[PDB]
Design a protein around this ligand. Structure first.
Ligand code: IYQ
Length: 164
């Protein structure tokens, strides 16, 4: 069902994550980690303390889709085997230092064509697919967007609710 999902999304904050390549999103799904640029890293650390759930909604650039969504389980931390991110033109690897742990809520795709009726007040009411990496999505639009994804029956939200 969707009752536990709605509970997790209750009073959550939502952020759009734009990745330049599929390889890093695949790595994030396999390992439960994400790294972003320092400007967005600071925003996510502040949000993590402020909200019962912080949700990252992922979209690979030029894919025309979202690839899933996940909940932050930690603030960013440095120190660990450098994740073997595929670095775009000038990512320095030092800018992708700072690793957040995430718990996937949905690893299924959603095409942008399915979200065309959702606009984001925090980005001038443009369609929610439009936005830069780290753009915050207002609560009602973010909740609706997450509910549009196909159910991911491989995920049990029971352990996620306990992190809360
Ligand atoms: C593992 N984390 C990531 N992996 C990849 Cl492949 N792309 C990411 C990313 N995080 C943000 N992006 C998008 C991006 C790429 C280069 C420059 C900017 C800029 N704002 O100038 C933004």
């Amino acid at each position: 069902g969707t009752s536990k999902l709605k509970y997790v999304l209750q009073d959550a904050r939502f952020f759009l994550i734009k990745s330049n390549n599929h390889e890093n999103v695949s790595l994030a799904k396999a390992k439960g980690v994400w790294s972003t640029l320092p400007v967005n890293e600071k925003k996510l650390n502040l949000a993590f303390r402020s909200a019962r759930s912080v949700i990252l909604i992922f979209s690979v650039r030029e894919s025309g889709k979202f690839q899933g969504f996940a909940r932050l389980s930690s603030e960013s931390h440095h120190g660990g085997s450098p994740i073997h991110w595929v670095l775009p033109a000038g990512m320095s690897a030092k800018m992708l230092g700072g690793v957040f742990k995430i718990d996937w809520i949905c690893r299924r795709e959603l095409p942008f064509t399915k979200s065309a009726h959702l606009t984001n007040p925090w980005n001038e009411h443009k369609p929610v697919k439009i936005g830069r990496d780290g753009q915050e999505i207002e609560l009602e639009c973010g909740t609706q967007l997450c509910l549009l994804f196909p159910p991911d029956e491989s995920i049990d939200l029971y352990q996620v609710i306990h992190k809360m």
